[PDB]
Assembly symmetry: C7
């Protein structure tokens, strides 16, 4: 039930299928709403770990003072407010997939702490003296210009080459015009069913509008606009007027 | 007992009715006193959750160091040394409605923490390793210029497109002149009853004054001025003089 | 035993009487010593809560890290604080009157925390998950130029319209010259009795002095000057010389 | 055994006597060593509380984080640490006299915390919910230019009018030349006795020196110089030479 | 299964062999992806400690407040949060090899704490009063310009002469063109086997491309590009086109 | 066994003797090595407390957060490491002598805390509510220009006049040339005995050198130079050559 | 097995012998690698304490908040000072030698804390009220320009004259050319034995190189270069070529 029609999206879909047999890190980039999370979850579903956990994590929103504790866990003992050991998210995802979302907003301090784990699967728990080993497939996404961040020294070169073994750059909706109408149709069908309405399609006038609008919020903005059009619709068809007052 | 008379307010009232069957996030904006909270509680009352809790929260006033704990709760254990787990507000609102007030004053740090929850309904408790899932309808309001905040990078683009699926921008009272007199009348009736007074209406002169005053505090300022007029009134009618010394 | 003689003070006294039947927030402003606390306590005495507690609070002097704890209390559990729950000042004033003094010096951070309570009477305790409801009549006073603070963004517009439902702006003594002599006389009587002296009144020369002095400390400065004059007095009358060396 | 000979010191002594029957706050100012503490303790001795405690406190040297605890005490509970309640200095001085020394060096933050207590005698303990009432006579002293501090906003106007009900401004020794010789004589007698020496007085030459020296340390500097002259003296008289090498 | 073909790499391999009998510190430098960790682990495998532990540590990512505790351990007692003593990483590596990675990013404060240990093998535990002695072979790597850091005072001269007894500076891939094709071939073989593909080699056109590309991520970037080429490949050979759209 | 030969040192020695019967504060100043501690301990030995404790304290090196605790002690309660009360140094020196070394380097914050104790001998323990009284003779020294510090406001005028009742300003060695040779001789005798050497005196040439050298470290530098000369000496006499290579 | 051949090194060796009978502080300075630690341990071995402990301490690398605790220890009680008392390093070295390394990097705050101990051997434990006395011989070393630090006020004059009773300034290798060849020979012998190689000496060409190279890392750099030359050597002799590619 996902839409891939434009040339680039079709290529992307192909790459996703071709890496099914692999477990190497994938770095997914693009503007807000272009479908990075959809692609990450799809890569997971088509992979050899489809039946293992998919642990999602906004890695930049974790406060700096608990970063290690949260990713690597901590050992019962001195570096403590605690009685017993606690698994971090790397262990929680052992044998599965760990999705580092907002990777490009991570602090330099935190990027450095992630460095050795990505390739070796090994780390010490906060306060522990036993190397722990996990087998985790890494996915990462960001809507930041990550190549620019590397150039400006805001993102570590050595972490970039570890994460971006496979690189999927999803283009903005406005450069995938072939996706627009099929996407709009897909949502119109979904919402019309969901809200028990009699909308069926768009006038030719409305379709022109959909194709010329920039979609700064990309697929998510499109989905929102169709969800509005359906809820406020009267006819069997959505006309240019109904859209124009929604964008 | 709410007043909607001007064209825009009537449209707004219609949108409110048309989204009764839906559960999508609503983003309510406008100057102080224009009725954002009234609109939020109305949306609730007309919705499929009217009978479930309506949890209000000034989300920007929560101190940064307890933000997660308060929204997501915390697990008994070593991240802070409490004894037992505690529900956050998302859980407390499960099956109901969560109203994020002052959303536009939220810090960038805190906006990022809210990001994944809005669409997936999933999060980890502070210190926990079990994904929790809730089904919460989100409403948000702010008297800040939220589109400008996005342009200036003071508010995340990706959070904006998640929150503003339905957008209700309530205009200032001074651009809804058709509401002014019915509002004043509504308050005059309410307070005259409440304080056992004999006031019945306004002179034609007073009404002109009400229509030309800017109402920088909008509906709330209007309500205050009428409450004063009634308490200090003598006649059966409020004349321009009694108002002029109140504004 | 309070003096209200000038036109404006007489109007103010009237407003105070006319709001006896009401419970709406009153915002009292004016220079140091003009009688803001007298007015606040008078409003209380003439109100329907005269027999309930009158909780005074310099709200701006509460340190920021305990603001919530102090106003809203805290739940047992809930952050290192403690074994058991503790009422905040809002609860302590339930059914009574809560006087927020120095309201205009409150920090922006703290103003925002007060926002929802003023109109809804509802809040959560620090660390609690049960909405608490109280019925508190709010009075507030400040010697700061609060309208200017709003214009400069130093004080929230939305809190100002919540607090200033009724607005009493008490003028400086120097613009209430009709109050000066009756005030001086009132104090002369009070202190002459208190310190067992034989002073009875002021010469005509002294009275001129009292009327032309600016009284930058207003009623309080006046009261101090008379208290001095009585303690250091010899005659049955206070002459210009005895005052001139006191101002 | 205190010396008051110059006109201003004689006036001051009179004011002290005339306020014996009173309990109003006294604000004592002047350069270092002019006798502020002597005046404060004298006011106490001649007052109706001569037999009650005289609690001295360098109020500006109390660290900001314990200011409330120290002045107002704290209730058991009160954010852990303590088991039981503790009286502050206001309570310790109940029925007595509380001498706030270095009042002019107090931080703005701390001045504000003292505000309501001065006139109402009421306050809450840190963490407490019971208003406490005490009956304390306040004295305050500073060697700072307190009127300038008010003008520059470094000292609150509203606290100044509360403290300075009676104002005693003690002049520097260099503007009280009539006090110099009697003071020097008084110390000469005191130390000559104390150190078993045969000094009796000063030559006419030495006296001229004493009168022309600025005395930047005021009475204290004078006392120090005489204490030196006596210890190092040989004759029955102190000559200009013995002084000149001491100043 | 490691590739050393270019002149400099062959020299480096020789040095590695010639130091097998030694235990002196080795300082390995070069751009990201040039093989510093491979060289460090190789030195270990060929050394007299091949069978002892190889403890890897990103020494610059350890937070400053726990640096000592982590390297030197801590004694049970004060400087606490603890009940019992804990070995640091120096002890954990006793008799083995300790690999200080990112040595050039270490803070000056931390560099100073490492100083005496490097040559003497002796240190006190945090809070301990017994000198501990260990026999640890030190390796260190960094992708920072470490000679420049010394010149700029960002890295201690005295630590530099302690660490760089043997200095291996690994050149970028772009200055080891003799390594490029054998490396590409090595990876092609490895991945073709791993992903069960029929790729065997590169066209002459592809090989030209590989030799002229800068390889800013060095061997790691090369390995990534080959891994892509194999996963997306169709033929038995990879042509220039398949590479060009990968670089 | 102390040397006082120059005119000023002889005067100083006389002052010391003349104050034996007194207990007033002495403020001792001068460059590093001129003998401030020698003078302080001498004043003690010749005083009426020679047999009571001499408590030395580098008062400026005490960290600010424990200043009160260390000088005034703390009451059980307060709530830190504590179960029981602890004497501060003022109490430990009760009946004895308290030597405040480096007084000129004390922070303004700390100077203020010392203020009331110096003359009244009274203070409260940290956290205590009982005034404690001690009888302590105060000595103070510093190598800072204390009169300049007062002028620049870096040192309180009111503390200066309390400390400097008796003032001993010890001149640099270079302005006490009469002391140089006897001092050198005194050390030569001391060290020659101590290290079993045959040195007896200095050549005329060496003595000229000793008299013309500035002695920036004053008596201590001189003592060091003689200690070297004796240890490295061969003859019965130290010649100019042996000194010249030591200065 | 230490080499002292040049004139200055021979003088230094002599001073070391001549101070065997003494216990006075020695201040050892010079560039990195010139042998300061060798000289300090030699002074110890030849001294009357050769058989007592030699406690080495990088005094500048101790964190400021534990400086006292570490040097002077702490008393049980004493701010959750743990349960029991703990000796500091001064006590641990009682009767022995305490070597303060990196003395010139010590903070002004910390230098002041060391001041009184150096000459009096007396101090209080953190939190203690019993003067402790120890008999410790002090050695100190630094590679910082300590005389310049005194002039710039970065190092206390009064501590400098306490530490530098005996001053050994070890010159750079480049100003001790007579030491170079014997040093190189000494190392060649040592390493040739250690690594079972057949190297015996240097060609005349190599020796010229050794003498003209600046040796910025001094004896340590030389030792490193010889250790490399021996490990990578083939002949019985090291020629200029083998060195030139090593420097
Ligand atoms: N190809 C697609 N077909 C159908 N639905 C899609 C497609 N791409 C995106 N969507 C929908 O659009 C919305 C945004 O997708 P997604 O959450 O993956 O965006 P994103 O690029 O991760 O955005 P952000 O940067 O804001 O996190 C989701 O509702 C997703 O289900
Ligand atoms: N349409 C309406 N009819 C009657 N009363 C109204 C209406 N809109 C608002 N009010 C009244 O005006 C007051 C302010 O409205 P509300 O609190 O909803 O404003 P707001 O936009 O949330 O303002 P703020 O941003 O300052 O919180 C309330 O007392 C509300 O009951
Ligand atoms: N109208 C009045 N009649 C008699 N006494 C008065 C009057 N107004 C004020 N006073 C006396 O003057 C003094 C100051 O009054 P009050 O403390 O209420 O002033 P305020 O405006 O609250 O001052 P501040 O801003 O300094 O807190 C008090 O002693 C009060 O009792
Ligand atoms: N009128 C007086 N007669 C006799 N002795 C006096 C007189 N005034 C002051 N002294 C003595 O001179 C000294 C001045 O002390 P006092 O503490 O009263 O001055 P102060 O103004 O409080 O100084 P500071 O600002 O330094 O605290 C004291 O020793 C006091 O006993
Ligand atoms: N000579 C070689 N032969 C085969 N594979 C190599 C060689 N050198 C490096 N690699 C491979 O390429 C990558 C080189 O990474 P390595 O960690 O050794 O580089 P690095 O310089 O330490 O990188 P960084 O500075 O980014 O940590 C690893 O996958 C390694 O396996
Ligand atoms: N008059 C003297 N006769 C003999 N020895 C002296 C004399 N004065 C000082 N010394 C010696 O010189 C050394 C330094 O003197 P002291 O420690 O008292 O100086 P200081 O002024 O306190 O120096 P700093 O400012 O460095 O503390 C001591 O060893 C002391 O014994
Ligand atoms: N005279 C000597 N004979 C033989 N070896 C020496 C000599 N001097 C120094 N070395 C060797 O040179 C190396 C550095 O010496 P040392 O550590 O004492 O120098 P340092 O001045 O303390 O250096 P840093 O300032 O870097 O601490 C050591 O291995 C030492 O053994
Ligand atoms: Mg996403
Ligand atoms: Mg609202
Ligand atoms: Mg007031
Ligand atoms: Mg005083
Ligand atoms: Mg590496
Ligand atoms: Mg000293
Ligand atoms: Mg060293």
């Amino acid at each position: 039930e996902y839409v891939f029609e434009s040339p680039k999206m079709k290529e992307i879909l192909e790459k996703i299928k071709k890496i099914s047999c692999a477990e190497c890190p994938v770095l997914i980039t693009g503007e807000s709403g272009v479908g990075k999370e959809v692609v990450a979850r799809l890569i997971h579903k088509l992979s050899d770990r489809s039946k293992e956990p998919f642990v999602a994590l906004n890695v930049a929103s974790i406060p700096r003072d608990i970063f290690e504790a949260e990713l690597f866990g901590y050992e019962k003992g001195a570096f403590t407010g605690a009685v017993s050991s606690k698994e971090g998210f790397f262990e929680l995802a052992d044998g599965g997939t760990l999705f580092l979302d907002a990777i490009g907003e991570l602090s330099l301090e935190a990027q450095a702490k992630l460095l050795r784990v990505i390739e070796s699967g090994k780390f010490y728990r906060l306060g522990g003296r036993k190397e722990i080993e996990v087998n985790v497939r890494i996915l990462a996404a960001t809507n930041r210009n990550i190549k620019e961040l590397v150039k400006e020294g805001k993102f570590r070169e050595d972490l970039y080459y570890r994460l971006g073994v496979i690189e999927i750059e999803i283009p903005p909706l406005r450069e995938r015009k072939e996706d627009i109408i099929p996407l709009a149709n897909h949502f119109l069908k979904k919402f019309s069913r969901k809200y028990a309405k009699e909308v069926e399609g768009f006038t030719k006038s409305a379709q022109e509008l959909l194709l010329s609008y920039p979609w700064y919020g990309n697929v998510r903005e499109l989905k929102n606009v169709i969800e509005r059009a359906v809820l406020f619709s009267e006819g069997k068809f959505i006309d240019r007027g109904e859209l124009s007052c929604l964008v």
